Amino acid sequence: DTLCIGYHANNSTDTVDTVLEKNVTVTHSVNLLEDKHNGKLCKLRGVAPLHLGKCNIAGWILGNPECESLSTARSWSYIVETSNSDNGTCYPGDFINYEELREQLSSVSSFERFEIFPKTSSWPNHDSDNGVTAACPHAGAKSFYKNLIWLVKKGKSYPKINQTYINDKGKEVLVLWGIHHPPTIADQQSLYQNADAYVFVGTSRYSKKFKPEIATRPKVRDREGRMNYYWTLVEPGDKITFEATGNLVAPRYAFTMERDAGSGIIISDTPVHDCNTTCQTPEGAINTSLPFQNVHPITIGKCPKYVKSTKLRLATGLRNVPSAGFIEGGWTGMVDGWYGYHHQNEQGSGYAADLKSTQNAIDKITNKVNSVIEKMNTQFTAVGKEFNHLEKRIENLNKKVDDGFLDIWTYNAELLVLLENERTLDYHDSNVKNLYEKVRNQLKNNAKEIGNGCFEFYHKCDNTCMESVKNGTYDYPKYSEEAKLNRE
Amino acid sequence: DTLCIGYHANNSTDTVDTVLEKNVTVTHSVNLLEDKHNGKLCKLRGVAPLHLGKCNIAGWILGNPECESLSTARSWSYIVETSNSDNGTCYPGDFINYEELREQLSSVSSFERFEIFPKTSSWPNHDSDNGVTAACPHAGAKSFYKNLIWLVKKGKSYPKINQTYINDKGKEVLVLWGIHHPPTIADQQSLYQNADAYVFVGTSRYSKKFKPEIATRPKVRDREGRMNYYWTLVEPGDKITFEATGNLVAPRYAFTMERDAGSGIIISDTPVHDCNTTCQTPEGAINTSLPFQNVHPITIGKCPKYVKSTKLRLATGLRNVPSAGFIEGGWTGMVDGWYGYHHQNEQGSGYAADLKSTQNAIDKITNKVNSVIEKMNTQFTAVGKEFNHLEKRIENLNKKVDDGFLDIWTYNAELLVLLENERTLDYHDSNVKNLYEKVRNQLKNNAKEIGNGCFEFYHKCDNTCMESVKNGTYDYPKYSEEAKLNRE
Amino acid sequence: DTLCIGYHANNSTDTVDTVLEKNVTVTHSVNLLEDKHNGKLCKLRGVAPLHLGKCNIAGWILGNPECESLSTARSWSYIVETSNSDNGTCYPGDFINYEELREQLSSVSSFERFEIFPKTSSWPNHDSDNGVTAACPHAGAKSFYKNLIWLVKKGKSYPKINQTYINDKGKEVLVLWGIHHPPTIADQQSLYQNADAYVFVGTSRYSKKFKPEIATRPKVRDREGRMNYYWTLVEPGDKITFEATGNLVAPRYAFTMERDAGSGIIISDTPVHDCNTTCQTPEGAINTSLPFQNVHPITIGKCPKYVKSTKLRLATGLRNVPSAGFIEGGWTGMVDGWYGYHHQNEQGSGYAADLKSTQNAIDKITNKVNSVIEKMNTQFTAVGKEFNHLEKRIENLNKKVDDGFLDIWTYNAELLVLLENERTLDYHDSNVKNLYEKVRNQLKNNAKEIGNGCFEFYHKCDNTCMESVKNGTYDYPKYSEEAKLNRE
Ligand SMILES: *[C@@H]1O[C@H](CO)[C@@H](O[C@@H]2O[C@H](CO)[C@@H](O[C@@H]3O[C@H](CO)[C@@H](O)[C@H](O)[C@@H]3O)[C@H](O)[C@H]2NC(C)=O)[C@H](O)[C@H]1NC(C)=O
Ligand SMILES: *[C@@H]1O[C@H](CO)[C@@H](O[C@@H]2O[C@H](CO)[C@@H](O[C@@H]3O[C@H](CO)[C@@H](O)[C@H](O)[C@@H]3O)[C@H](O)[C@H]2NC(C)=O)[C@H](O)[C@H]1NC(C)=O
Ligand SMILES: *[C@@H]1O[C@H](CO)[C@@H](O[C@@H]2O[C@H](CO)[C@@H](O[C@@H]3O[C@H](CO)[C@@H](O)[C@H](O)[C@@H]3O)[C@H](O)[C@H]2NC(C)=O)[C@H](O)[C@H]1NC(C)=O
Ligand SMILES: *[C@@H]1O[C@H](CO)[C@@H](O[C@@H]2O[C@H](CO)[C@@H](O)[C@H](O)[C@H]2NC(C)=O)[C@H](O)[C@H]1NC(C)=O
Ligand SMILES: *[C@@H]1O[C@H](CO)[C@@H](O[C@@H]2O[C@H](CO)[C@@H](O)[C@H](O)[C@H]2NC(C)=O)[C@H](O)[C@H]1NC(C)=O
Ligand SMILES: *[C@@H]1O[C@H](CO)[C@@H](O[C@@H]2O[C@H](CO)[C@@H](O)[C@H](O)[C@H]2NC(C)=O)[C@H](O)[C@H]1NC(C)=O
Ligand SMILES: *[C@@H]1O[C@H](CO)[C@@H](O)[C@H](O)[C@H]1NC(C)=O
Ligand SMILES: *[C@@H]1O[C@H](CO)[C@@H](O)[C@H](O)[C@H]1NC(C)=O
Ligand SMILES: *[C@@H]1O[C@H](CO)[C@@H](O)[C@H](O)[C@H]1NC(C)=O
Ligand SMILES: *[C@@H]1O[C@H](CO)[C@@H](O)[C@H](O)[C@H]1NC(C)=O
Ligand SMILES: *[C@@H]1O[C@H](CO)[C@@H](O)[C@H](O)[C@H]1NC(C)=O
Ligand SMILES: *[C@@H]1O[C@H](CO)[C@@H](O)[C@H](O)[C@H]1NC(C)=O
Numbered sequence A, B, C: 001d002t003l004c005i006g007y008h009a010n011n012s013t014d015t016v017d018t019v020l021e022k023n024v025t026v027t028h029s030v031n032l033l034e035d036k037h038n039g040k041l042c043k044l045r046g047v048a049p050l051h052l053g054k055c056n057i058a059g060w061i062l063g064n065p066e067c068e069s070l071s072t073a074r075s076w077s078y079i080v081e082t083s084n085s086d087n088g089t090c091y092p093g094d095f096i097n098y099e100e101l102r103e104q105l106s107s108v109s110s111f112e113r114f115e116i117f118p119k120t121s122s123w124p125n126h127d128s129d130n131g132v133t134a135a136c137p138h139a140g141a142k143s144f145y146k147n148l149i150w151l152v153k154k155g156k157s158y159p160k161i162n163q164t165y166i167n168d169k170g171k172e173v174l175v176l177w178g179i180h181h182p183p184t185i186a187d188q189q190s191l192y193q194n195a196d197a198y199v200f201v202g203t204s205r206y207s208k209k210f211k212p213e214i215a216t217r218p219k220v221r222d223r224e225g226r227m228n229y230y231w232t233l234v235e236p237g238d239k240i241t242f243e244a245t246g247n248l249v250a251p252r253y254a255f256t257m258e259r260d261a262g263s264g265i266i267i268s269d270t271p272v273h274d275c276n277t278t279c280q281t282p283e284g285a286i287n288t289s290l291p292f293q294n295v296h297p298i299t300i301g302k303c304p305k306y307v308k309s310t311k312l313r314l315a316t317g318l319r320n321v322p323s324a325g326f327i328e329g330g331w332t333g334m335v336d337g338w339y340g341y342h343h344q345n346e347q348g349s350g351y352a353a354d355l356k357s358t359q360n361a362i363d364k365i366t367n368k369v370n371s372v373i374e375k376m377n378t379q380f381t382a383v384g385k386e387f388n389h390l391e392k393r394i395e396n397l398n399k400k401v402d403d404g405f406l407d408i409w410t411y412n413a414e415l416l417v418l419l420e421n422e423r424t425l426d427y428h429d430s431n432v433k434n435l436y437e438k439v440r441n442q443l444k445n446n447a448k449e450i451g452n453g454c455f456e457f458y459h460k461c462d463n464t465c466m467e468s469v470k471n472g473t474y475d476y477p478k479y480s481e482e483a484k485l486n487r488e
């Protein structure tokens, strides 16, 4: 009877592109590109994110009346703003180096708001009750920022501030303040009793001077004067000193801080849920061990690299043809293996996988698709970055970097899978052919090969025929004597 | 007679490098690297470029007397300056954020100069005729910028400007102005009657203050005082307000604008011609569907990627050896095909390509070289960028990005073509070998193979021999009986 | 007797990874990754480095008292600061654009300190002896910077400086100056006799104004006023002008300069030695012709590209198995070659390499591993770059570029060597097989092949057997008559 050699063919319609041939089907494949994400904003790197809801960083750090919460976590791995974040610097004016504060805050390994200049009698001879405005209203009354105190004359005088703090808390200490630019001299003289108003701030690493710019301006939130917000980072043991003979919005809470390398902001409405995470996108978290993703180019954490492609499928299985031997096609009559034998005997009709060869193959195939993933060298990054009104050369430079790595990675990846699919899908045919040859190493003359990729054995035998194949032991010349007439 | 198998060899001397063997010749090749360009500056993306001729952007936007033209197009896809562009800010002084204006202007989807502060009586009690000087001369008379008005006292007083505009035109509105720094107090008091001179500008997104710096300076164009040029975008519905109690060079034309993503400047003398374009270089336009180019690293549009290489040629044809079968060499006696048969019969001497195999091959070869081009993912960019006197850390950072992508792309590309040439130039030999084997699938025993890669058939036959090969139908055992004595 | 075919196997345990099989041994290999460096800071590009020892650039250019040397070379290819560099701007205050000056200085093709405003009577009516301070002491006395002169009133007046220089030396001329900010009005009035103190500086390409910021500050080096340091390049034929009615620290030495493209700073303690160099790292110099290095990511010169990998070894030799023919294993009984023949004759026992085939192989293998190196396109760069307190968006952008090229290069390199090891280690088996087939082209029927990968020859012969193989001339049918009975 015959002995036939070929491969498991399977009901699925999984398809892989190969550089030689588009749109071909393979019996099993490993998808490397994540098209699906978990739809949530999630706990990352052991800690929850800071979620700011209706209010942005320029309102949270100022403590806008319309935003009130504990720090989402005394340690957090990113900042999230909702897609609506209209609340902010509700009293208008530019937050200076605001895109830099937004970087340093993005991750902190501790944070504690602490009242370094406490509202209780740190400010004798001055107001700290009635510095309030309609621009940031609550209860329909005048109200104000909670983290900063807007000082005003008491009575008919403004004693110059001389406040000092010495950083004894053994930490980086973030400090902030504001400066007020009244719209008119009449407003300046009424609140601050001084046209010569100025501020000075002193530090070791830093020192700067500020002055008012009294001039009428277009209405925003119907406010006509405007407020400049500034910030500073005093190192351990350093000292910070304020002086003012006028305009100030002095700190009342400073903030204790420490910072790791960090990772930036995300802006979206997705809700927050407990599950742990390593990789993040604006749309939703990902849990993965794959090299490439296409769901969004912005990322936090151990990013998989973004690509514009859609079907990065590596083959693992064979060319799927159910359409005799491999030259006609495979067998769906075979299961739980790859390459194998159909054989006949007195009981016969056996379809069985060759486990030693299949196991040898899948050892190397597992290492192959694994080498594509294990050698990726992913490392902690935050891909989206923030640039203001007049940084457009650098903003476009960023964009050139971002699309350069995109263009490289799609061309690398799409040619990569094409070359390794071209390899593997002939790797199978070469392993099958080599297994056929390995049967020729017994059946050198004593069987009729047929162009289907199969044998006719020249004389009758029991299952001891397949015993001779599986253990390669064949004792050829006796069996030619039974074959004799059928060869003749 | 013999049947011989091999391949078309050709009179051309086209060469391809392969990682195993340098400088080898192949019968046909696809050049992927453009060494040639069309030598023109051209219509791009459906719109003509702005060509500024003898005058640079800092003179065009100011409207230098020595530059006069309509906007080259009411919509343009890039700005061109000629390699000589000496005219510009002919009254000296720094154009502030000038490299940012040069970016935002680089492309516009509409632009219209419109006289938002018209020269007719917008300036009562003030001069607007005699603000002219020799530094930007015409007819040998004093002259001045056309788009800006240099105001001066009328009589013996300078009433404070209070000009306002409200953006009702439903567009981004670009506005510009100048500020004058007289060289001495005597010049300041004579023109502006005020030592306390200052300017304020107010907006929602912006506000700033400016003051004179009265001090003598080294002569340039023999002007000793100097002029600072500033600019602003007012958003739809926003308001802009000027105040001045002195030095101003107030706007008279503002400009309506809208901007797409855009693409930057080119600087060269090449003339302008009508034909449409997608890809640009400083030397000359390109029309292409190739992935790599080496003519210039600066680019606009859907750039092909730059490389330092010179001979990115993919093979498509075979190893060209005219120097019997393929082991001796190919046949120049064969045409309009690749792999093929020489056969003999009573009429005989046939050299003919095997069209089904050749067509099967060229199907896959076309898809191969096409996959290298189609998967490139080119996208709209402008590679050259501009950095001033004191931005050199960023200028070098740009240069590190530019040469990084260069170093990657040449090493990728040159190894890429080497690997795929190494593949294809054995791909041919394996296809030819497999075609020989496919003849062995008839001629298993009934022909003498010879070490040239050819057959002697053991008995005489008509063209029905080639009929048996072309249709694989051979009826072997009868034909052994005529072969009998010649095998014996 | 027998003719046996296989390959040299060798005592070494050099190992290569292949995508199909980890940790396999190969007889010989070319390491592409420099694990080792020469431990020195070295002469580069034909010129010495500048080595600044105990003092940093912000003290050298000022000429701190504790820093005294010639320029280490009148031309230098990089600046080196020792890992201790605590001396610097020993009178405190920000060196303005200091990270930019640190770039332009990094390499100079000439530099000469020259006393453009010589201490001899360029400063009538003013002090230049007693402008000294305890903040930069020597001998326990007051002392001061050497390259700058701190002017002070003489008597009870301060005549306005009006110094001028015209760049007649035909070079770029670097100029520097300081500005002093006394801590109190009392200190200002006592030293400079004027409250209105200001400085102006004039140039063609540049002009600016400066003023004092008199306010108390936290002690550093127990100094309470602070000093701002500024700089300028005047172009050939250009003029520079100083004016002051007060605070100045005027130049006394300017510096003649010219600059190439340049390459940045290194900071380390490694000692300086004479040997010439092209490639550099902070730890120690390198001399190399390899593409990849992992010893440090910061570099100068013609950098090899950094990777995080550890064992980029290309194969050159074969699969090493000493464990009959190649199917059992190789021979350590063979030397000075690769593929070869064992043969027998009346004297016999010959093990000899096939020199024409081995030479043919090593021609192509040498070109292979060479093509991986020769095409690298290395070009002169300086990878580490410097960003200050408030440039963290750009500092992180740099970091995204740096780890992008890292991530690309490890993934490219590790998959690159895996693919070419997978290629070569079957390239050998295919060349050996083809050499076996090339013996079949004589021994078509006239020898018994055995599954070890070897021949038994059917009749007795002298060394003329190996003569027939080496020269492919075999006269088959005349010899068959001795083989007759042994084939029967
Ligand atoms: C998500 O992540 C959290 C951490 O943020 C996981 O908490 C895990 O909790 C177990 C105990 O339930 C921790 O193990 C125990 O920790 C204590 C000290 O806390 C130690 O004394 C015990 O011997 C034991 O190790 C575990 O360490 C902690 N995980 C980590 C990463 O620290 C939580 O289980 C995670 N949840 C999910 C659904 O993955
Ligand atoms: C170069 O590009 C221009 C466009 O900038 C090409 O103009 C083409 O002109 C033809 C008419 O000759 C347009 O076809 C007709 O357009 C009208 C609207 O204008 C429409 O109603 C008709 O149905 C028809 O489409 C054609 O659309 C237009 N091209 C484009 C892209 O809009 C010009 O022909 C090009 N020249 C060369 C030499 O390539
Ligand atoms: C390290 O590099 C230095 C250069 O910085 C090498 O100096 C070499 O010295 C030899 C002396 O025989 C020079 O040869 C002669 O130079 C003169 C001009 O100086 C010329 O007129 C002669 O015809 C001859 O070329 C040699 O040119 C010079 N090298 C270079 C690159 O100019 C020094 O030898 C190097 N040392 C080591 C250990 O590599
Ligand atoms: C942020 O607070 C501001 C006021 O501080 C809110 O602004 C007002 O919003 C209402 C609608 O809710 C508008 O009709 C008013 O015109 C807004 N005020 C002004 C002065 O223009 C705003 O709603 C808050 N944002 C969010 C997201 O709750
Ligand atoms: C730009 O205009 C300036 C004057 O506004 C021209 O400068 C003069 O050029 C001539 C040579 O053509 C010189 O001899 C004069 O000395 C220049 N004048 C000054 C005041 O420096 C200049 O030629 C114009 N540029 C172009 C390209 O036409
Ligand atoms: C740089 O010079 C400064 C003084 O100008 C030196 O600083 C002193 O260092 C000693 C220790 O060596 C300290 O005890 C003193 O308190 C420091 N003086 C001041 C004023 O702070 C410094 O040592 C020099 N640096 C080097 C590397 O030699
Ligand atoms: C077809 O394949 C699916 C998916 O593996 C499997 O669940 C199913 O049992 C198969 N059915 C048949 C009829 O082969
Ligand atoms: C690939 O197969 C799908 C499903 O049958 C078919 O729709 C598509 O047209 C095929 N692709 C091409 C390139 O024809
Ligand atoms: C300000 O505070 C310091 C604290 O040391 C004190 O010595 C000084 O007298 C105060 N007043 C002024 C005007 O500096
Ligand atoms: C026969 O084959 C099986 C599976 O390979 C093996 O375990 C067994 O030892 C072999 N027996 C002999 C006698 O070779
Ligand atoms: C040689 O090749 C060229 C270009 O393909 C062709 O035009 C020409 O006719 C050929 N000539 C001969 C003599 O083969
Ligand atoms: C390739 O051949 C051409 C023509 O003879 C010659 O110019 C060139 O130098 C050769 N290149 C190599 C690498 O031998």
Ligand SMILES: *[C@@H]1O[C@H](CO)[C@@H](O)[C@H](O)[C@H]1NC(C)=O
Pocket (backbone or CB within 6 Å): B162, B164
């Ligand atoms: C300036 O213009 C505004 C326009 O609303 C006007 O109300 C105001 O009175 C003008 N004058 C001054 C001095 O502001």
Ligand SMILES: *[C@@H]1O[C@H](CO)[C@@H](O)[C@H](O)[C@H]1NC(C)=O
Pocket (backbone or CB within 6 Å): B470, B471
């Ligand atoms: C012989 O070959 C041609 C071309 O392959 C084919 O059209 C024809 O049908 C074949 N003959 C028969 C009898 O099928």
Ligand SMILES: *[C@@H]1O[C@H](CO)[C@@H](O)[C@H](O)[C@H]1NC(C)=O
Pocket (backbone or CB within 6 Å): C011, C012
């Ligand atoms: C083993 O290899 C080393 C290094 O190639 C060589 O020096 C030595 O002589 C070899 N020894 C033996 C015994 O093969």
Ligand SMILES: *[C@@H]1O[C@H](CO)[C@@H](O)[C@H](O)[C@H]1NC(C)=O
Pocket (backbone or CB within 6 Å): C022, C023
């Ligand atoms: C490689 O071989 C070494 C011994 O030389 C062994 O310790 C190591 O485990 C092997 N590698 C792997 C991946 O098993």
Ligand SMILES: *[C@@H]1O[C@H](CO)[C@@H](O)[C@H](O)[C@H]1NC(C)=O
Pocket (backbone or CB within 6 Å): C162, C164
């Ligand atoms: C300053 O120097 C210039 C040029 O030497 C000279 O003309 C001028 O009179 C000097 N004095 C003043 C006050 O400008």
Ligand SMILES: *[C@@H]1O[C@H](CO)[C@@H](O)[C@H](O)[C@H]1NC(C)=O
Pocket (backbone or CB within 6 Å): C470, C471
């Ligand atoms: C035999 O082989 C050697 C080495 O290849 C060669 O030099 C010699 O010419 C050959 N013999 C003949 C008769 O050609």
